[PDB]
């Protein structure tokens, strides 16, 4: 009668993980955001396993990092040494 | 088993004869007397000690076996027949029992 | 001629009144109804499963209890008709318990490594005149690596009926009397050894009073 | 004789057709038992095969009517501050009383759904 | 006779739910020299370490507080057709009683 | 003493061994039946021919099917089986036809 379990649409699942830049808007002029995802020694872009971005927002980062090198907005071979103490969101091992 | 009964009795005849062989008046006489006599009775020159002649008590020369475990209408007596190595696994049970009632309280 | 006391307890229905050693309530409070993950369910636990709760498979306790009026009844008859009952598990967490329960009753245990060819090659492993078991009771149908036991095949190769505890990952197929229930829980198989022990020693003392009644009349 | 072929049938059917043949003379000691009180499923071998396509498993993911208000208590407040026991029968958690202080209110209490938490927000401290 | 579907609804495993970081009390049921085997109910046991705070208070039957992380400890790996249970739980000890 | 066995294949089969060089063994396949519905087959092998013969004759009576038949002569219905690559097509027929079938199926 009333007793048996119903079919409902699966509670106790918190809504899915919004990455870090989920509703935000990357620019090519927004160098201090873009310089956060390149390496402070080599200038190379950290990957999706490091940056923790979704594949949508990782690709807008890379399509705007490479947009900004040729326009004269950010340098290729290093992080902007002025913009070095920003919140280190990219997880990387070295010197623990 | 009636294969051992015909060799215990045949031994005590050959014990009683060997005291009647030699001059030893005690018809009850020691085994190292028997080991001494037959060596001096049957002189080998053989090199192995297990190749020289021996007449001994047959439980000590025939190897020992388990007896049969199934009586009539089957029913093997041990509660671990159907392992094989039937006494080892019980002797592993006697030890595992012997450790838990310790830890239930406290060459 | 001794076939008066063989052909009564096949006509009687639940002759040993085995429907008193359990209900769903005793089975609930010792956690029979819990099964493993929905990740490792089998195909043939599919009828026996109530559902999954947050991915934990829950075993039908109604469909459990309609097996055990029928599974414990048959292992009562195997104790009545004097057949050899072998207890097997490979749990290693109840391996003391199964063998100790085989001494508390009068039938058999084997909870150790399974030598290859224990039932299919018995006649050279033992003497040539061995009465092989007439029912095998499993308490873990799985092996210490998670595939079904050796003796679920060699039971059926040697044509022996078998009652087996089947849990959400086990294989119910070749064993004739599945018991869809828990086996990994220490309260569950204390219950399971309690019903299987008492159902045969009640079934043994039924066999004692009937032949004595026949001995007098 | 006997047959050792566990694929080709049940051990009943691999025996009750061997007594019709007359290859085993003695009637095995489980045969006249199993015939009388048989299992609800004949233990024929089947090879287990994998679902490949649009064939999900027909089990039901069980959910109960009181799961909503249970879910929100682990959202807006914490977990059980009181610890669990689960050894005693009928343990009533701080959520299990909270779902029962919800399920008197409806039926036909029916003020607003958020308000139905507002009425039971007050009552548990009292 | 009570129906199974009813007594599953009134069952404290069902009432718990998604077992992440949930305060559970449990019995200890086997002591090994360092490793504590806590039977909380459930299907399985769990194994903890013997802490340096009150390290003699953990005997057989000692009711202990548990965060009860995630009764699973199952995972499917790259070849597998089922998934590899370990028959454990990874519940972390907290205290006593 | 009411069964009889018939040989179905003798095959000089070979493997190759580090010391022995070439090694011959004999792979026999027998069929065993008794009339009356129960029949079975087995494969056994050894190096010697009499050794393989006894090995399969004394094994085939542990793997025997009950071949359920119609009244004594024929089978119940038409069957059409494909077995690994072998199509077999076998038909129910009326009494006194004869066994017009492959010479191995004759002896079974
Ligand atoms: Zn995103
Ligand atoms: Zn299990």
UniProtKB/Swiss-Prot annotation, chain A:
GO cellular component: mitochondrial inner membrane; mitochondrial small ribosomal subunit; mitochondrion
Main localization (coarse): mitochondrion
Similarity comment: Belongs to the bacterial ribosomal protein bS18 family.
Disulfide bonds: none
BP terms from Gene Ontology: mitochondrial translation; translation
Claim: Mitochondrion is one of the keywords in the record: yes
Protein name as annotated: Small ribosomal subunit protein bS18m
Sorted UniProt keywords: Mitochondrion, Ribonucleoprotein, Ribosomal protein, Transit peptide
Description of how the protein assembles with itself and partners: Component of the mitochondrial small ribosomal subunit (mt-SSU). Mature mammalian 55S mitochondrial ribosomes consist of a small (28S) and a large (39S) subunit. The 28S small subunit contains a 12S ribosomal RNA (12S mt-rRNA) and 30 different proteins. The 39S large subunit contains a 16S rRNA (16S mt-rRNA), a copy of mitochondrial valine transfer RNA (mt-tRNA(Val)), which plays an integral structural role, and 52 different proteins. bS18m has a zinc binding site.
Name of the coding gene: MRPS18C
Further comment: There are 3 mitochondrial isoforms of bS18 in mammalia, localizing to 3 distinct sites in the mitoribosome. bS18m (bs18c, this protein) binds to the same site as bacterial bS18, mS40 (bS18b) binds to a novel location of the 28S small subunit, and mL66 (bS18a) binds to the 39S large subunit.
Lineage of the organism: Eukaryota, Metazoa, Chordata, Craniata, Vertebrata
GO terms assigned for molecular function: small ribosomal subunit rRNA binding; structural constituent of ribosome
Subcellular location field: Mitochondrion
UniProtKB/Swiss-Prot annotation, chain C:
Result for mutant: residue 81 to H: In COXPD36; results in impaired assembly of the small mitoribosomal subunit and impaired mitochondrial translation in patient cells
UniProt-listed GO biological process terms: mitochondrial ribosome assembly; mitochondrial translation
UniProt entry keywords in alphabetical sequence: Disease variant, Mitochondrion, Primary mitochondrial disease, Ribonucleoprotein, Ribosomal protein
Coiled coil region boundaries: none
Subcellular location: Mitochondrion
Complexes and interactors: Component of the mitochondrial small ribosomal subunit (mt-SSU). Mature mammalian 55S mitochondrial ribosomes consist of a small (28S) and a large (39S) subunit. The 28S small subunit contains a 12S ribosomal RNA (12S mt-rRNA) and 30 different proteins. The 39S large subunit contains a 16S rRNA (16S mt-rRNA), a copy of mitochondrial valine transfer RNA (mt-tRNA(Val)), which plays an integral structural role, and 52 different proteins.
Disease: Combined oxidative phosphorylation deficiency 36: An autosomal recessive, multisystem disease resulting from deficiencies of mitochondrial respiratory enzyme complexes and mitochondrial dysfunction. Clinical manifestations include sensorineural hearing impairment, mild developmental delay, hypoglycemia, and intellectual disability.
Official protein name in the record: Small ribosomal subunit protein uS2m
Organism: Homo sapiens (Human)
Residues of the whole record sequence present: 58 to 274 of 296
From Swiss-Prot, chain D:
Top-level lineage group: Eukaryota
Residues with the N6-acetyllysine modification: 101
One of the GO BP terms on file: mitochondrial translation
Membrane spanning stretches: none
A GO-annotated cellular component: mitochondrial small ribosomal subunit
Keyword entries, A-Z: Acetylation, Disease variant, Mitochondrion, Primary mitochondrial disease, Ribonucleoprotein, Ribosomal protein
GO molecular function terms noted in the UniProt entry: RNA binding; structural constituent of ribosome
Keyword Acetylation among record annotations: yes
Annotated compartments: Mitochondrion
N-acetylalanine modified-residue sites: 1
Disease implicated: Combined oxidative phosphorylation deficiency 46: An autosomal recessive disorder characterized by childhood-onset mitochondrial respiratory chain complex deficiencies, particularly complexes I and IV, and hepatic disease.
Family affiliation: Belongs to the mitochondrion-specific ribosomal protein mS23 family.
Subunit structure: Component of the mitochondrial small ribosomal subunit (mt-SSU). Mature mammalian 55S mitochondrial ribosomes consist of a small (28S) and a large (39S) subunit. The 28S small subunit contains a 12S ribosomal RNA (12S mt-rRNA) and 30 different proteins. The 39S large subunit contains a 16S rRNA (16S mt-rRNA), a copy of mitochondrial valine transfer RNA (mt-tRNA(Val)), which plays an integral structural role, and 52 different proteins.
Name of the protein: Small ribosomal subunit protein mS23
Residues of the full protein shown: 2 to 127 of 190
Swiss-Prot record, chain E:
Ribonucleoprotein among keywords: yes
GO cellular component: mitochondrial inner membrane; mitochondrial small ribosomal subunit; mitochondrion
GO biological process terms held by the UniProt record: mitochondrial translation
Positions carrying N6-acetyllysine: 57
Lineage: superkingdom: Eukaryota
Protein location: Mitochondrion
Residue intervals passing through the bilayer: none
Any one GO molecular-function label of the UniProt entry: RNA binding
Keywords from the named record: Acetylation, Disease variant, Mitochondrion, Phosphoprotein, Primary mitochondrial disease, Ribonucleoprotein, Ribosomal protein, Transit peptide
Record disease entry: Combined oxidative phosphorylation deficiency 47: An autosomal recessive, multisystemic, mitochondrial disorder characterized by intrauterine growth retardation, swallowing difficulties with failure to thrive, hypoglycemia, dehydration, and hepatomegaly. Additional features include global developmental delay with impaired intellectual development and absent speech, microcephaly, facial dysmorphism, cataract, sensorineural deafness, skeletal features, and cryptorchidism.
Protein family membership: Belongs to the bacterial ribosomal protein bS1 family.
Official protein name in the record: Small ribosomal subunit protein bS1m
Provenance organism: Homo sapiens
This protein's encoding gene: MRPS28
Full protein stretch here: 77 to 173 of 187
